[PDB]
């Protein structure tokens, strides 16, 4: 039957023989068991080694394989994908399909993955009660069989499907065959923008219930206005025998405390004429003062659920944490406990470089930490149920949850065929009401998500109006088919920007501003997914935040996204190296797109992060005189684990600082008075750096932890000093070819064929390997390249424009050089254009004034033809001689900053090792660069002007030309682009021009001017 | 201090170039012992007669933003046109510029000049390239005001009627003017976007005889 019937290909069979769907059990035997959350012995892992074979079909699986092991099967660890241990390859595409659209059909070479297991089942779970098997994630399908006889059939991915295994077992050894296809009409579902992976990917294991068993239950808290009185309220559902001296007992403990207790019979309240719920009861308990769950202070209580005998034999315990919270939506403002949330969000994909789409405790914990450290506060399961260790840890750690059903049709045209076609409705019910069932015991849960990317279709208003029908306690929301449908409770875009208006046909993007003011519109916004941190990205992240903080039903985001989904390879020699899209022979492939993490996939920060955390600060600050007002963003905890740490500084050299522990309500103010602080004699400008500490460590952070920060400028004095006159002349020397300058054991030499410094000499040793070059390119950076689909070429790109304006290949023609002897200088003046088939694009006029005390001052004006596209950058760059460990700045630091992302990025004087001077993103780009610098040392070399700059052992060439940052070689030296100004980066998203008007650099005439010399 | 700030010279030296004269000038504006303003320059005159002016200005972030940044002196010419290639042909500023259009404009004298009740700076225009008066010829990427009045007298006479026509012709030539606000009129109004708060600004000017 199992051949010929073909499940796999039928959207009508999405299991055969399953369990109903159900809260997480352990059919705990001992009350206190159940309340310490201990191990359960009716609950068996059977995580380990498997036997696996792979097979190009199911058809081509030998029947033998039922009864009997095969000898050509490995020994594997299972939970896993298959991809990752060789058997075939990871697949990452984008929107279109993996296979061939023809729904509900699959490729006949499905690739098939034969698991199998040799176990012990002891006597004392087969004499009495009810043994089941649990598979947590199986993709895509599967079909199952125990001691050679077929069980059952499963879909959907991403939830639980389990199986009675009672009449299969017998003592002693027992064998299990699951035949796990890749490939199934469930995958029509499942197009998420992911690799592309197969294999018995999450846990497996035993359950032993009791024939009377508790089989369901739902806990809800209610609340009266101020939350100073709550009802917790559970339904409990038994199956087996109904009998009258049967009881349940639901108690609620906080610690070792017991503080409510109900007892009931079965049997619920009459429904309606046929009567009531002979297998329910619902027990209601009081609770006075709750302490109340947010992600700020994660309040919980245990529930423990004892199915018993009136006289008191307990029969079997099911237990879960509970958050007493209220989540709702009232006046356009979603309120968790009566107060409006900020979201602070992050979509995450369960992801690992090593294990592929496998989780393990430790990443789960590793990801939480990092992101309550960078003041995340929210997290968006994209785009499918996560393992079930996730809501229990965003349970105990403090995260708000947005759980999203495993739904996503992108590749089809339009995005809503399957998802309105009721032929799909019950596949797609399945996906959404399963994920309920299983997760509505979760305080970290407060919304529920339809799924992502379907379009709209009417399967979607039918299962909104389900969720709402069957859980009036969260939210329900859906981006699919414009943000703004029938279909969700939040407007809830994607990539829609702060002031701008993209107004596609009919699923327009508006200004998020402006979205919320439209005629008859009253709902909360909140981006499901905005600021897509693709490598170097998240500029403008700022203006988001601003917005934020400005419009009450703005209330925050899931930044796109937590984790790069880069893979692990090794090289010839062993050596590990990140991949992306297509470099598994995977074809087609949409390459580096599934790379748009703020961290890297072994979970060190990008740059972007820091941005991030800063910009999602819980304290806000205001400079008034010599008043610092704080104020708290925290709905619910005062600031009991802070304090303010401040310094005054003088182009770096510390003048005054001290500390203030702060003592702040929720959305109060703090007004603190720092001291009179003495005039420094020196010129320069005075800055304020405030830090707000955390004294204590926490559950999720380190004493000493900082977890907020701000910057301003105070007193400057202008230096009026004249530097002391030098007794030396430089002397000037003509050729044909040059013009050189002496000064002591000083040389410049200027080409008069080029027009620019080639060489420049100190002790006779040559300090440039290229010559010193106005350069007004970039490597581009994924926003510049502008892509989502590798097939997709756009000629409105950023890179496309310059390309096709010839910015990257037109070449400098000298149009003047001269030299000048002057009283105590030499004066060198250039002019250059640069053309690209006949048409000037750019004209730089500089002079070099080198003078006696040895300092070269350059002085740059720069012409950029307003008709063609604004150029990446104005500035200088050259190939030094010289290697040095350190890097010295004053200026925007320490990490990489760029014009659009240098919020986090405070003044000071840096000191950093060359290394960390380049960030290693994996599909590299132009990086590195830090703004607002005034002072410049690397070796004896030192640059002083008001500049960006980046140093490194990469060429912008190198950067542009190599497409995986292992591939890098270093090169001789150390190149140096110092530039006067420097475009954005954007990021709104990174597939369209994304780089706001103001970060262009569209003002025709650029000036700056740098010192060069030794110290 | 703004209205009252004395120039103190800081350097002022001259150079001789193969075609050129080349002098530079430091200047710091201060008030009572603060540092203001400090401008840099170099003008440069070669054998055609034109005298290339650039301006490099340091403004202290701690003073309030100022209103201009720009050079002024009293022609002697007194001439019945005003002919520019800029934004007109009406009074323009950076805040109030959309109106105005790019154009070769060619004014008497007094429309140069807006006659408020309340007199005040007046008929500045914008993007202006090139001017023309008289004799002279001033080219670059400007913002400009020119009259018999100065802004002195603009700002110590009460009523239009009462301003009288000084001697010559008093010009304003601005690398940077800041907005003129609106909003309201009893509370700061000029847009962050519009306010002079740069710290370091440069604008460059050729003067020559036309
Ligand atoms: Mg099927
Ligand atoms: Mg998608
Ligand atoms: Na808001
Ligand atoms: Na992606
Ligand atoms: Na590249
Ligand atoms: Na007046």
Redesign the pocket.
């Known amino acids: 039957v199992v051949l010929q019937r073909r499940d796999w290909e039928n959207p009508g069979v999405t299991q055969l023989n399953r369990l109903a769907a159900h809260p997480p059990f352990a059919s705990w035997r001992n009350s206190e068991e159940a309340r310490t959350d201990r191990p359960s012995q009716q609950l068996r892992s059977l995580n380990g080694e498997w036997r696996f074979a792979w097979f190009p079909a199911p058809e081509a699986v030998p029947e033998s394989w039922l009864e009997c092991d095969l000898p050509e099967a490995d020994t594997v660890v299972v939970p896993s994908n298959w991809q990752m241990h060789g058997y075939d390859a990871p697949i990452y595409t984008?929107?279109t399909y993996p296979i061939t659209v023809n729904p509900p059909f699959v490729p006949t070479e499905n690739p098939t993955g034969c698991y199998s297991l040799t176990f012990n089942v002891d006597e004392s779970w087969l004499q009495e009660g009810q043994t089941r098997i649990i598979f947590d994630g199986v993709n895509s399908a599967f079909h199952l069989w125990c001691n050679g006889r077929w069980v059952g059939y499963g879909q959907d991915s991403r939830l639980p499907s389990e199986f009675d295994l009672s009449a299969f077992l017998r003592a002693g050894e027992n064998r299990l065959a699951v035949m796990v296809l890749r490939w199934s009409d469930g995958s029509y579902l499942e197009?998420?923008?992911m690799w592309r992976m197969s294999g018995i990917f999450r846990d497996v294991s035993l359950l032993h219930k009791p024939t009377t068993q508790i089989s369901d239950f739902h806990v809800a808290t209610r609340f009266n206005d101020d939350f100073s009185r709550a009802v917790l309220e559970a339904e409990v559902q038994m199956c087996g025998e109904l009998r009258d001296y049967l009881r349940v007992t639901v108690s609620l403990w906080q610690g070792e405390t017991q503080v409510a207790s109900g007892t009931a019979p079965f049997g619920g309240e009459i429904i309606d004429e046929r009567g009531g719920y002979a297998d329910r009861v619902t027990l209601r308990l009081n609770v006075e003062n709750p302490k109340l769950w947010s992600a700020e202070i994660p309040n919980l209580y245990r529930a423990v659920v004892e199915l018993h005998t009136a006289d008191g034999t307990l029969i079997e315990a099911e237990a879960c944490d509970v958050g007493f919270r209220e989540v709702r939506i009232e006046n356009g403002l979603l309120l968790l406990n009566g107060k409006p949330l900020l979201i602070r969000g992050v979509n995450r994909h369960e992801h690992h470089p090593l294990h592929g789409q496998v989780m393990d405790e430790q990443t789960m914990v590793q990801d939480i930490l990092l992101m309550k450290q960078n003041n995340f506060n929210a997290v968006r399961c994209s785009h499918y149920p996560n393992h079930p260790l996730w809501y229990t840890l965003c349970d105990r750690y403090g995260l708000y949850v947005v759980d999203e059903a495993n739904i996503?049709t992108?590749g089809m045209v339009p995005m809503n065929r399957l998802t309105d076609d009721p032929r799909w409705l019950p596949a797609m019910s399945e996906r959404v009401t399963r994920m309920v069932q299983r997760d509505r015991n979760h305080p970290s849960v407060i919304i529920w998500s339809l799924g992502?990317?379907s379009g709209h279709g009417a399967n979607h208003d039918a299962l909104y109006r389900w969720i709402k029908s069957v859980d009036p306690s969260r939210p329900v929301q859906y981006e699919g088919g414009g943000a703004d449908t029938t279909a969700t409770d939040i407007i809830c875009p994607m990539y829609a920007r702060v002031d701008e208006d993209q107004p596609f046909p009919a699923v327009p993007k508006w200004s998020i501003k402006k979205w919320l003011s439209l005629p008859g519109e009253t709902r909360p916004l909140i981006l499901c997914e905005y600021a897509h941190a693709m490598g170097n990205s998240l500029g403008g992240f700022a203006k988001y935040w601003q917005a934020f903080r400005q419009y009450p039903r703005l209330q925050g985001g899931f930044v796109w996204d937590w984790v790069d989904q880069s893979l692990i390879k090794y090289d010839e020699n062993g050596n590990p190296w990140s991949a992306y899209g297509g470099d598994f022979g995977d074809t087609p492939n949409d390459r580096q797109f599934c790379m748009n993490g703020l961290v890297f996939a072994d979970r060190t920060p990008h740059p972007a992060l820091t941005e991030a955390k800063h910009q999602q600060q819980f304290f806000q600050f205001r400079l008034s005189g010599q008043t610092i007002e704080v104020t708290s963003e925290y709905l619910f905890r005062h600031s009991d684990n802070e304090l303010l740490h401040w310094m005054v500084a003088l182009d770096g050299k510390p003048l005054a600082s001290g500390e203030v522990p702060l003592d702040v309500a929720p959305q109060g103010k703090q007004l603190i008075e720092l001291p009179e602080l003495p005039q420094p004699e020196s010129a320069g400008q005075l800055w304020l750096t405030v830090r707000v500490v955390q004294p204590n460590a926490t559950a999720w952070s380190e004493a000493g932890h900082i977890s907020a920060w701000q910057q301003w400028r105070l007193a400057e004095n202008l230096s009026v000093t004249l530097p002391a006159a030098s007794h030396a002349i430089p002397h000037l020397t003509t050729s044909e070819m040059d013009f050189c300058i002496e000064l002591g054991n000083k040389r410049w030499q200027f080409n008069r064929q080029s027009g620019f410094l080639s060489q420049m000499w100190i002790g006779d040793k040559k300090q440039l390997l290229t010559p010193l070059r106005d350069q007004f390119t970039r490597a581009p950076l994924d926003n510049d390249i502008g892509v989502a689909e590798a097939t997709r070429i756009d000629p409105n790109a950023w890179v496309e424009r310059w390309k096709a304006a010839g910015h990257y290949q037109a070449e400098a023609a000298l149009l003047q050089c001269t030299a000048d002897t002057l009283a105590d200088a030499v004066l060198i003046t250039t002019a250059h254009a640069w053309q690209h088939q006949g048409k000037t694009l750019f004209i730089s006029r500089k002079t070099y004034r080198i003078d006696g005390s040895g300092q070269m001052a350059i002085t740059v004006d720069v012409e950029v033809a307003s008709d063609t596209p604004h150029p990446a950058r104005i500035g200088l760059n050259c190939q030094l001689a010289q290697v040095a460990e350190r890097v010295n700045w004053l200026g925007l630091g320490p990490q990489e900053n760029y014009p659009d992302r240098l919020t986090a990025a405070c003044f000071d004087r840096w000191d950093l090792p060359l290394s960390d001077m380049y960030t290693p993103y994996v599909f590299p780009s132009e990086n590195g660069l830090r703004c607002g610098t005034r002072e410049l040392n690397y070796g004896p070399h030192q640059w002083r002007g008001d500049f960006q700059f980046n140093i490194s052992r990469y060429s912008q060439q190198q950067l542009m030309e190599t497409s995986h940052r292992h591939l890098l070689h270093a090169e001789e030296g150390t190149w140096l682009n110092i530039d006067g100004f420097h475009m954005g980066i954007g990021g709104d998203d990174s597939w369209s021009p994304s780089v706001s008007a103001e970060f262009q650099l569209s003002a025709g005439r650029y000036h700056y001017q740098l010192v060069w010399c030794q110290k």
């Open positions: 984008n929107v197009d998420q923008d996503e992108h992502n990317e």
